[PDB]
């Protein structure tokens, strides 16, 4: 990771998400909604950078579009929870740091 934020690719995604809990931002750099989230997502990863039980990731859908499409990502940013290899949630709520952190807490219980 880079200060807690894992860059995921078609080459490493399956290995990465196979065990544990994961919160992953599927994004495109050209999309304003996605770009606006980037600093907050970095803060989220930073606060969790030493944790094993949750890992914060991102997938650039301009580089790995088939991985995005294969996970039914239809627009950016799409924020997905994976647990032990399986997509288990999509987070559609407010994208401030506190809301994201409280969601993470909810999902790790």
């Amino acid at each position: 990771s880079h200060m807690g934020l894992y860059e995921l690719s078609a080459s490493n995604f399956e290995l990465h998400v196979a065990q544990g809990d994961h919160f992953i931002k599927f994004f495109a750099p050209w999309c304003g909604h996605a770009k606006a989230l980037a600093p907050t997502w970095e803060q989220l990863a930073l606060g969790l950078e030493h944790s094993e039980t949750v890992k914060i990731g991102k997938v650039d859908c301009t580089q790995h579009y088939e991985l995005c499409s294969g996970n039914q990502v239809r627009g950016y940013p799409t924020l997905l929870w994976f647990r032990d290899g399986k997509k288990v949630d999509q987070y559609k709520g407010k994208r401030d740091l506190e809301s994201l952190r409280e969601y993470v807490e909810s999902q790790l219980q």
């Binding site: 050209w30 999309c31 909604h33 996605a34 990502v73 627009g75 709520g93």
Partner: peptide, 7 residues
């Protein structure tokens, strides 16, 4: 909330 750019 939930706003996105379409793929």
């Amino acid at each position: 909330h939930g706003e996105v750019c379409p793929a």
